[PDB]
Amino acid sequence: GTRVFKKASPNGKLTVYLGKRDFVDHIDLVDPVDGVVLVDPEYLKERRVYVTLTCAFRYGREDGLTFRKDLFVANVQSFPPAPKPLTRLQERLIKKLGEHAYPFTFEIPPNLPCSVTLQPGPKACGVDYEVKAFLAENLEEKIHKRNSVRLVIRKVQYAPERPGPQPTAETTRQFLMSDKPLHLEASLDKEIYYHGEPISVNVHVTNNTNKTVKKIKISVRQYADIVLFNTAQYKVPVAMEEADDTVAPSSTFSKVYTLTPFLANNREKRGLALDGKLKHEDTNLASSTLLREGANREILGIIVSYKVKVKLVVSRSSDVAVELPFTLMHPKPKIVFEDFARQRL
């Protein structure tokens, strides 16, 4: 039936239940983090149960950190209940789990960065979301690790396909020791693409020169800018098609090329922004960072964007190129207990 993900604290006395691992950001709002926390009463002994949701930017090795910045923290006291309406899943889970199952809910602000991990090779950085449930007498009391449970949830970006005009074409005019120019014009089929979806690139060349285009290189490039702790810029090709298609002198050429950027091909590449850990199978290339008008760019930690590049290799050699921006999003999303740990393949 309904899949519910759970994780227990090391001692087994505190257990957290969530409906999903990935909470979709719909730009306007984010899926609520609706969960339940079960507690052992003999072990409770008149202690409070807290649940914390943290969004943090981290920089440095996973394995005392080098850098960590909390971008958002939300705390809720689940036991005793604090002076909110429950969801279908929470109501269904309390009935099944019993009188010691207490609800927790967080509303993730939409302006926060989506989950992103940047692998720089043999160091790392990223934005992570963590649900932490723990039992204690107050927030000021230092927590015992066996009395706490940590679940790494993700915020993933989804945007609906653009209802409007076609994506604008990119052009370039270049003179190649010539009286008249070579005109390169390219366009993409859509503005928004999802992970695993092919990208079609409509290439148009009006070569009014006496030179010949010997080949056409089509590629998808990821651009990842680190904007916290250590300002840096990465550029990684994530898809490449080298076509041996020529454009004769004084001639017009037109062709549609299709490419699909896949993480599977770029596991070895460095400076690559992913939407999760490389070890987890549900990880894809990072989605494009949506920049709202007047938003603080710095507090997003890592800014990801994509472009398709169309390069014409000319004989003499020389290069004529255009770059086409596009948005890469997470695909449209979609009682038995399951472990929260994400699978590797």
Q: Which domain holds residue 251?
A: 170-329
CA pair distance 152, 61, nearest whole angstrom: 17
Determination technique used: X-ray
Strands 116-119 and 272-274: antiparallel
CA pair distance 273, 271, nearest whole angstrom: 7
Residue labelled with tokens 């939407």: 275
- Beta-carbon count within 10 A of 173 CB: 13
Q: Is 177 annotated as a binding residue?
A: no
CA pair distance 77, 138, nearest whole angstrom: 10
CATH number of domain containing 217? 2.60.40.640
- Encoding tokens for residue 51? 């649940």
Q: Which of 138, 128, 189, 152 is nearest to 18 (CA)?
A: 152
CA pair distance 196, 330, nearest whole angstrom: 9
- CB 103, CB 167: distance < 8 Å: no
CA pair distance 235, 323, nearest whole angstrom: 13
Sign, CA dihedral 62-64-66-67, equals positive
Q: Is 240 annotated as a binding residue?
A: yes
CA pair distance 102, 165, nearest whole angstrom: 49
- Encoding tokens for residue 89? 């899943």
- CB 337, CB 7: distance < 8 Å: no
Q: Which residues of 67-104 are buried (b: 16+ CB within 10 A; e: fewer)?
A: eeeebbebebbbbeeeeeeebebbebbbeebeeebbbb
Strands 182-188 and 199-207: antiparallel
CA pair distance 52, 156, nearest whole angstrom: 19
Q: Which of 111, 108, 117, 110 is nearest to 58 (CA)?
A: 117
Q: Which of 210, 75, 182 is nearest to 133 (CA)?
A: 75
Residues 6+ apart with CB under 8 A from 229: 57, 59, 67, 69, 125
CA pair distance 239, 233, nearest whole angstrom: 19
CA pair distance 159, 330, nearest whole angstrom: 8
3-state secondary structure 81-97: CCCCCCCHHHHHHHHHH
Q: Is 329 annotated as a binding residue?
A: no
Q: In what order do the strands lie in the sheet with 170-174?
A: 170-174, 182-188, 199-207, 251-259
CA pair distance 111, 301, nearest whole angstrom: 12
Q: Is 307 annotated as a binding residue?
A: no
- At position 274, the amino acid (one-letter code) is L
Resolution of the experimental structure, in angstroms: 2.3
Distances (CA, A) of 43 to 98, 147, 149, 229, 344: 16, 10, 15, 42, 34
3-state secondary structure the chain: CCEEEEEECCCCCEEEEECCCEEEECCCCECCEEEEEEECHHHHCCCEEEEEEEEEEEECCCCCCCEEEEEEEEEEEEECCCCCCCCHHHHHHHHHHCCCEEEEEECCCCCCCCCEEEECCCCCEEEEEEEEEEEECCCCCCCCHHHEEEEEEEEEECCCCCCCCCCCCEEEEECCCCCCCEEEEEEECCCEEECCCCEEEEEEEEECCCCCEEEEEEEEEEEEEECCCCCEEEEEEEEEEEECCCECCCEEEEEEEEECCCHHHHCCCCCEEECCCCCCCCCCECCCCCCCCCCCCHHHCEEEEEEEEEEEEECCCEEEEEEEEEEEECCCCCCEEEECCCCCC
